[PDB]
Amino acid sequence: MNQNLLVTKRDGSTERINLDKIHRVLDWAAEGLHNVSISQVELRSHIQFYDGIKTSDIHETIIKAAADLISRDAPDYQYLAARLAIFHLRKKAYGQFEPPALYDHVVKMVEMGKYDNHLLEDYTEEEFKQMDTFIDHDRDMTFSYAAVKQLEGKYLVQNRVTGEIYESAQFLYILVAACLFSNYPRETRLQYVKRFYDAVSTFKISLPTPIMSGVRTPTRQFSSCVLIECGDSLDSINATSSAIVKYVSQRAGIGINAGRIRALGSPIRGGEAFHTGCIPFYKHFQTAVKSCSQGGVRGGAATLFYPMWHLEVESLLVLKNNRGVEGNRVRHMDYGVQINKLMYTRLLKGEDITLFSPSDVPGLYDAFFADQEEFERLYTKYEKDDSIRKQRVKAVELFSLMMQERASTGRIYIQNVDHCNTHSPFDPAIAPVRQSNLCLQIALPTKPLNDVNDENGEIALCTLSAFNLGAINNLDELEELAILAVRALDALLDYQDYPIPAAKRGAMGRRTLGIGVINFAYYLAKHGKRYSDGSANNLTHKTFEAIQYYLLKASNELAKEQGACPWFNETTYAKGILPIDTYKKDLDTIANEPLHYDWEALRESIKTHGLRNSTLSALMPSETSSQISNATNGIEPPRGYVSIKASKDGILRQVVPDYEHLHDAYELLWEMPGNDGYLQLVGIMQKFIDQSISANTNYDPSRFPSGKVPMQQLLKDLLTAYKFGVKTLYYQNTRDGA
């Protein structure tokens, strides 16, 4: 009759229950939300309370309870859960809800070895006092549950043994800002810190996981993905392999070009035994890729590229097909088949495609990426020469084979190599694009290594970021954001460490960035457009012209200030060539939107002061980043309105943004009748994008007679992609509700 329920605290143990403290906290969290029942939450959680339960479990339970009510029809549960979680996480890090003063926090963290000591060297206590005035810890309340789960899961500084969380999102943002602009002149340094801080805490700019989890800590390893090109020599094979090992030990995604390795049967190049062909080496790269992963299979990913006409093409095309002899399969690596105009024309005219080992056709591989005229001339020339080892295949059989394997595994990608070079920032004769990265968005110059420390090699890197199309009000907010996006990334280039000499060379030489968007889908829904009808073509053209124009303007502004990238002379930009001058002509037939920007002024400003960065845009996919800002991923339409993630903490649900008002406005992935709509939008985006876009093809068997996708439809889509100048083609998804 004093039947209490004793809560136990962090070794302060016993104490009576406080159901009113709890209600206040809930009540607080609910402030401003619609359709959430605090009683409902209390009911679900109080029933699992037991006599000596620790306070931490009360919080977990009330958090879970709130999160288990998230739904399409009560979407504010995400915020109620989020806020409870944020609250708990404050107490878990700081002992109170009120974050310590920035200076104090940073000092404490430097002594504990969690933050880089240079933070205190670079900024004065007065400077930290001021940054603290920029910080707004109430922005922690804008995250959705899924976001808090990601922050807590892989962004906030923590102890991964003990489980202790040491920081709050706002210190992350403020310090990422500080580190990235730490070398700025005292005159502008803190203005920049604040501007960026704002941008990233209000989700205008998104940043890669390695960056958000690390900049501010003592590491200097921030790579997401690297591109290595293998030469036809054991030395290069060795070096390529070494480089992969170093890079997967730092969690980097690998894009390997192994197209030049000579085919099986070719002559021994004085000691180098390539009698055995590519496969054996491919296997060797796969083991290198997986050298620092879990069983010898879990973690570590890579995509390997080779020309369609390589002599072992048919054996390469089925490397991930599970039904086959173990020695003739390299299953845990995706492939990128490289095609150009002539190959497709052979398909269209029902003619043959000649296979050839690169070793035997002098100048053919080079021409393949850099000059299509020349490629044609050497190709026909070598077809006729009977001295040259070769094989014929009917183009139809080859294309179907590749499309078949693309279809079943979903991981046989395409790269249109002519598009990559005729419509690129680089001069094909000096710095051609001959491969992509893991997720087929990056397109940059690479040179083969002769030894792991070869200083004349070149490895390209992923330097990324993104604009949230859902958090900007008008496209002119992109000028400010381009500034901050480009300036922070450019700083990062100098900040971080390079494991391999050839990777520093490419970064310092061309300072290449890949900035893209996220939240595209939601953006299209607020403007009442759709993917499949062609209704968003001019909007897309208006939006990607604004993204490209401002990125170039900010990079140009930056070159004026600090100088163009050392190798700016190898870009087409240097010769006064713009993305609007080399885009694929057929786009003119699917969008009339007129350029709204002074491209001619900028063309001259570029020719005269050059660019800080040789490439600025690239549209990547993005699950994590997107989730933190509650946004639809990169440019892809959502599968459905509520997406589900698994966890140790239960089921995490996240409702698409503003489902309340836009449910009928969204066009979910399987609602699109086919791919034409979307491929048109990717082509329009490709007009302005420096590198490439990770574009997917999607088929639903329900929509076809007998549930089988015709090879006709598959090829027609492939050609639709090539006709609107799509550079690459990534995943292919099959199914009708996920």
Partner: peptide, 4 residues
Amino acid sequence: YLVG
């Protein structure tokens, strides 16, 4: 500017 442009390097030199």
